[PDB]
Amino acid sequence: MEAYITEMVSRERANELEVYVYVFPNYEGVYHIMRAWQRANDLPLAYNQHTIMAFSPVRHMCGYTPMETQKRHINIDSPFERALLERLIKNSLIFTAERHLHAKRVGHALRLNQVQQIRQVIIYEAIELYVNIIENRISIGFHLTHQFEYVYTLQSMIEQGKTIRPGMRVVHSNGRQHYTYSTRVIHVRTKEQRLSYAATLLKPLCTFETMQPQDVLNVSKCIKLSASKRMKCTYRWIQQLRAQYRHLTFAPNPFTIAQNGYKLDQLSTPKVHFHRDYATVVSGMKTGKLYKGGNIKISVLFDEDFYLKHHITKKDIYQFIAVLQKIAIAQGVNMTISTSTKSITGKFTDDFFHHFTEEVEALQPIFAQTTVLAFITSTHLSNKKTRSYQLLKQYFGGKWDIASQVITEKTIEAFQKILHKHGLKNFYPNDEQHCLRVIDVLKNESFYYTVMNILLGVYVKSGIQPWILANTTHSDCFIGIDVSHENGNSAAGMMNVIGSQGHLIQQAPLNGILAGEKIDDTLLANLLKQMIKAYHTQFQRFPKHITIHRDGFWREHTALVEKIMSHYEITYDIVEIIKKPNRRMAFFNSVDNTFSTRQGTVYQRGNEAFLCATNPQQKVGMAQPIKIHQVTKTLPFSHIIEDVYNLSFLHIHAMNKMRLPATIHYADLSATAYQRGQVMPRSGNQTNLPFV
DNA sequence: TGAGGTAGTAGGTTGTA
DNA sequence: ACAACCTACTACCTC
Ligand SMILES: [Mn+2]
Ligand SMILES: [Mn+2]
Secondary structure (H helix, E strand, O other), rough: EEEEEEEEEEEHHHHOOOOOEOOOOOOOHHHHHHHHHHHOOOOOOEEOOEEEOHHHHOOOOOOHHHHEEEOOOOOOOOOHHHHHHHHHOOOOOOHHOOOOOOOOEEEOOEEEEEEEEEOOEEEEEEEEEEEEEEOOEEEEEEEEEEEEEEEEHHHHHHHOOOOOOOOEEEEEEEOOOOOOOOOOOOEEEOOOEEEEEEOEEEEOOOOOOOOOOOOOOHHHHOOOOOOOHHHHHHHHHHHHHHHHHOOOOOOOOOOOOOOOEEEEEEEEOOOOOOOEEOOHHHHHHOOOOOOOOOOEEEEEEEEOHHHHOOOOOOOHHHHHHHHHHHHHHEEEEEEEEOOHHHOOOOOOOHHHOHHHHHHHHHHHOOOOOOOOEEEEOOOHOOOOOOHHHHHHHHHOOOOOOOOOEOOHHHHHHHHHHHHHOOOOOOOHHHHHHHHHHHHHHHHHOOOHHHHHHHHHHHHHHOOOOOOOEEEOOOOOOOEEEEEEOOOOEEEEEEEEEOOOOOOOOOOOOOOOOOOOOOOOHHHHHHHHHHHHHHHHHHOOOOOOEEEEEEOOOOOOOHHHHHHHHHHHOOEEEEEEEEOOOOOOOEEEEOOOOOEEEOOOEEEEEEEEEEEEOEEEEEEOOOOOEEEEHHHHHHHOOHHHHHHHOOOOOOOOOOOOOOOHHHHHHHHHHHHHHHHHHOOOOOOOOOOOOOOO
């Protein structure tokens, strides 16, 4: 029942390692000299900014004379030598893995033999290794993944009667620098560049999108391993590598958390507020009323294809909606359908979805001041000829500020299939008697979260707060910052889950410049002042503390934050959230000799921690940890971890728990929606989440 | 696009005594 | 050039 992490700390120390340093007379310095020495002398090496470090003397120098040669230790007070030693240790590990163990260096990983073969698709194993120096100690971390390839090359396809597309993606698999694009010549293009070489080298690219069906099923079955198999296969190769490595020594069992220095904490599930205290969200939603009800005016957008290509009539659509209005009335929410849709009856045909741009302008007054319930076939939404989803969002959210919920034909087909399979198909809706039986039937199957998620989307897009946290957080205000790349121009977002119980109060785009992952000083100051003013508008006071959650690495300027929060006399903390730590944590059970994972587990060391926030099934995979880093110091770090974990139970748009806290999960979605132009910055309203 | 989860693929991207 | 995150897409199973 011990706690295991994919890391190990060496018995040796950073300044106890004897190394050889060569100093020679751009960041690409002494690299060709490194390659020459590597080929000539057959020993691991590393370089950093015109300096080479080795573990053994270099006999042959290939006619190169270093300015200085030294046999010394590292200066731990200088991070330069720390980085150089880290690179040397990683290179030595790679060198020792390639020999004695038959490993290749492919891409960014180490290809490790073949594990599966699925109808001319080869699956290899692979591993990543990382070296860090923390307080005169060396820590090695490692992560196991997979790799895909096709057996046949383009040479085997030019013959045997097979064709080639003019511009399909092909791969030239070489050593560590693989690209993406008889003995016939194949002309290929990359970026803006034309070239050609032998067809035997190139192979077709292996991705999920391009693989034929009946292959994705089995590939997914192989590459979705449980906790036990993943952890065992990860530790077996590292134990194999320890035998051949002798520059550093480790413990007999280096993989526990005591040997790594972490300490263990176990958090608890917060209480949620549905007009009372509820243990879980599901319990509150099944048998409880909302925290803040109200009235909703819904409208209907129905396309004729439901009747033309499928067998769904408008009567069935209104029968489905009548079920929604009956579940909602039991939660304090009253929904009414606008009657303006009758004047535009018979519209929304194929021609309408082909000339949407011309036809939508006169359709605005019908759907004004309502929450649209679009009923569109998935073909229209997906087809690139129409692209109806993007245009609908751009014209309803990006203009006219109208919230809309989209439903495809698959949901209605599943609902109708379940309706037929349980009888009671004769009548529904009116007379308010068959609706109760329909709800009773629905409540005992898996098609209950679909209806509830549709309802939750409607509520949240129409200004309703389903529930909040029943206990206030340690801090009084949370500000979440997120950015998106989108291959060039970058859109960002600063948002407020400020309330100690959980309430959107304001959202704000970081449209101005921002280049990439950098917020201008004036922009940051103005946004912080706007956020604090927005908090002053509510609660009629100022917060005693503020916590700033940042998606990624905190690359901003701390002096401005300190000055601004000192002007208003508020304490502040800055926390980095890392959602891809590339580490795995698990509990080992010796009685059954198996691995497991528990939600709300924290491994903390110094001002860094790993948090477990999800509980996936065996066939879904193994839980992904979250890395929490504290940049400043004003509160205990355990309080920071507890607040981060608590703020993730606020997935008010879905009954399924999200891994990340609300400050990040509602910021990335907002940034993504704003980048595509589905939200206008004129309003920036509170408690409304059209993008959610 | 009912939503979440995890896990492959391809590319940015900022800092470097 | 090396590290360590980030972005986007696709696929499946769960509720
Ligand atoms: Mn994001
Ligand atoms: Mn949605």
